[model samples]
Target: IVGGYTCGANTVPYQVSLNSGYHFCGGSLINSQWVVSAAHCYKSGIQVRLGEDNINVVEGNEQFISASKSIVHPSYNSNTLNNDIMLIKLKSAASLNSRVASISLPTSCASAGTQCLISGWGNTKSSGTSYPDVLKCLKAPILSDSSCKSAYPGQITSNMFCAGYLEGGKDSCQGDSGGPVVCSGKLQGIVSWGSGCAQKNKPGVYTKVCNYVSWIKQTIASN
Candidate 1:
């Protein structure tokens, strides 16, 4: 979360942290029982913590639910990180409240240059470990696909998009994978991969959530 600030408690109501024993990835609650996150962050015995602001403190607003199961995208490619998305079903439904709510998934695709907000408990610096206890966030624009393709050269795919300043210094980092990127209050993307934290011409890459709207709906309906 380079070039960002600590978020107010419950400001990102849908944001949740994925943990086993400790926080490892971020995710978004899309419903009482479902979370959308990056497939690359997948692991067994995961728990979902909702309504969390400062992970170190028990704010009483948080809900820790064990994952009943998780379904990674079947087409997911590890090397390219293509189709880097997953859906986690909670062991039990989360009770909604002012501090814990679900985010609306996007039906339409976001165009390039759309401003979005990304929140996470990721590293605050470009190097070394500097994970913040409180959730941090920053506003970044969705880069044009052509420009993103140019920056990565044969790495960018339709399933993935880039966001951040080209000159750098603002990005989702380690421990932030699977976090939400909200555009117009709707889930737009999930932090998937990037070159470094926030390097020049190397923007943060995310799973294009819009493309998987049908997949998400079908999974939730049938699972």
Candidate 2:
């Protein structure tokens, strides 16, 4: 979340910390063996940690796992930020517990004005540029595609969605990428990209999860 509040540890059991020797991005556990994140979060040495809230020290309940593989979408575009979703195959299944669980995926697009939330360990402020040790969360309202188009013009695509306040303040920032956008108790979007963090009239853009559910299911099945 942009101008958000500190989230309680273990409150989001499905939340994950994607690391590349260090924390690089956030993610969501979708199943025992799969983690979902933004394609842009892809790196050569990415790994994962779960059941964690603080990165300063290893929590007793934390589960450390290596990514067997990072699967980026075939149609992913670095320039357009289109199809910016991927799945991480864990070396072994994540042990489900009070501190570890998977989030449910949505079956349809979220309607405009619906309230949603985003959680991560991204920058506390867009300018200060300091990543918090604890997780932060903020609430947002889904903006209509027309509103998004007005904000992004030709940039908004079918695979993308927008959420934030036109007045600004609440939003996702750096390091929050690949995190979850949950609405109506389901995973709705993957933190993809935005012009800048919490800028006026520039809401955060996300990868539309519902649009890629089939691709996600097929990829996991084939893998």
Candidate 3:
């Protein structure tokens, strides 16, 4: 069952856990057999659970899909987190239950200032541990290209999109990478980086889903 404050208008916001015990990050199901997330979340053993309120305990009919393989973007940089995107190919297609559904990726690219949804199990505060069980999410308007460039300066690239509040709080943090940044019922971006969790004057950066449309389509088509 869905819990927590509902501040966004998206259909496929969800989270993934590396080790059932700890370390949970957000993600979105792009297709029945594909899950999109951040490259950093990939580990030896990871499980993607959908439609579950409590991350600690698997409740209701929450589905767990085993990843057959994880494909991280070839240009991913661990240090700067550039091109920090990855796709998880599920071993089998998930059962099309009402509680779980696939999210649609953007066909065309979007410019800055597009409103989107950011969901995760990351820390609510600027610095601290992530939320225990229930995942949290919020709505954030896309930051203008000029605003993002000014904030990151040499770091921000056109391949990235920025979101969140410049005032502080209401932002995605450490454990939130790879989470969905949905807009208008379409997956437009994936959480890539931010200025230290949720901090003032620092917005979260994401991999522009629209920029990688060809890659996503070809990858899904081949698989």
Q: What do the candidate models score in CA lDDT, each in turn?
A: 0.94, 0.91, 0.72
Clashes of 3: 1
List model 2 lDDT by residue over 164-201, tens digit each.
Answer: 98888889988999999999988999999998888899
Ordered from best to worst lDDT, the candidate numbers read 1, 2, 3
Candidate 3 lDDT = 0.72
Tens-place lDDT per residue, model 3, 178-209, is 78888887888888886686567788888888
- Would you list the clashing residue pairs of candidate 3? 38-178
Summarize candidate 1's per-residue lDDT along 121-178 as a digit string, tens digits.
9999997878899999899999999879998998988999999989988888998999
Which candidate number would show the highest TM-score if scored against the true structure? 1
Task: Give the count of colliding residue pairs in each prediction.
Answer: 0, 1, 1
RMSD per candidate (Å) reads 0.7, 0.9, 3.2
Model 2 score (lDDT): 0.91
Quote the positional error of residue 205 for candidate 2 in Å.
0.3
Cα TM-score per model? 0.98, 0.97, 0.88
- Residue range with the least summed lDDT across 10 consecutive positions in model 3: 1-10
